Amino acid sequence: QKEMDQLASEVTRISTDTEFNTKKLLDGTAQNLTFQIGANEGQTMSLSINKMDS
Amino acid sequence: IRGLDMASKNAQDGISLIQTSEGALNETHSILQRMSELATQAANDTNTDSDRSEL
Amino acid sequence: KDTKVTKGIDISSSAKAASSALTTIKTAIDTVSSERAKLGAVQNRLEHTINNLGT
């Protein structure tokens, strides 16, 4: 169980520490990420990464 | 004759007045063109508000 | 007193706002192109008026 709690505490670290730019990706806050792939309005793509912690 | 040769100066003094205006709008086009790149970059959601306000 | 400041269209409040500004900017390019050739049309006419006045 000592390694059980240490592995499960590292899964949580990756979720709260993984950060592109200043955005936490895997903590459930990166939702509705809109990429403007196109030169006009509405030429976007959405994306939602779920919370992936222990 | 002295009217048409003088009215030809007026026509050319209007050509200069018009070249100046469209010469100026030649740059409002470039500014508006650059101003449109700073809205396709600001629309991407990899930017943060610290960087949208930076744009 | 009477100091003017100009503030650009909103692109920093959100990604939706920046996309909204895209049509506003691309329309402004359209109403500048309209003005430029409203002045290029007059200049073309004035070039014909000069040859006819000279003749």
Side-chain angles (χ1 to χ4, degrees):
Chain A
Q1 187 91 52
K2 276 173 192 16
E3 195 158 358
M4 209 54 209
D5 310 357
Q6 208 76 21
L7 289 186
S9 162
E10 163 85 22
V11 169
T12 303
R13 199 200 51 97
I14 303 184
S15 64
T16 65
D17 286 18
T18 293
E19 176 229 32
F20 183 82
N21 205 335
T22 325
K23 309 180 106 318
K24 290 321 174 327
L25 307 162
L26 306 175
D27 69 342
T29 62
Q31 310 252 337
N32 305 336
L33 295 176
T34 280
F35 308 125
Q36 171 87 2
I37 44 155
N40 287 308
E41 273 253 338
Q43 304 198 0
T44 68
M45 176 178 73
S46 66
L47 169 74
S48 317
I49 318 145
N50 297 272
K51 186 160 178 267
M52 284 279 138
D53 68 327
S54 64
Chain B
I1 296 154
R2 294 168 76 157
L4 307 161
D5 86 333
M6 164 81 57
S8 151
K9 301 181 185 116
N10 300 0
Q12 185 64 60
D13 297 354
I15 278 174
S16 309
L17 183 140
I18 277 160
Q19 267 202 4
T20 303
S21 316
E22 77 211 40
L25 294 160
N26 184 34
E27 274 287 341
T28 297
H29 258 298
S30 309
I31 302 153
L32 282 186
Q33 223 85 30
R34 174 63 166 138
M35 216 177 323
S36 166
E37 305 188 17
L38 322 161
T40 299
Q41 201 178 348
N44 198 34
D45 184 1
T46 76
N47 291 56
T48 40
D49 305 68
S50 149
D51 324 305
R52 299 212 170 80
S53 64
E54 201 36 32
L55 290 160
Chain C
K1 183 178 179 180
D2 307 67
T3 59
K4 299 157 198 352
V5 175
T6 321
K7 171 112 204 146
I9 196 42
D10 193 25
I11 69 180
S12 62
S13 42
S14 162
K16 293 179 179 179
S19 286
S20 302
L22 248 182
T23 74
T24 310
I25 292 168
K26 281 164 142 97
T27 287
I29 307 183
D30 275 353
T31 88
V32 168
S33 313
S34 287
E35 214 72 13
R36 288 194 72 182
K38 200 187 44 70
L39 302 177
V42 184
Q43 164 146 209
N44 293 354
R45 157 177 185 161
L46 274 171
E47 272 151 29
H48 288 301
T49 313
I50 276 185
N51 316 343
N52 162 67
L53 283 171
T55 314

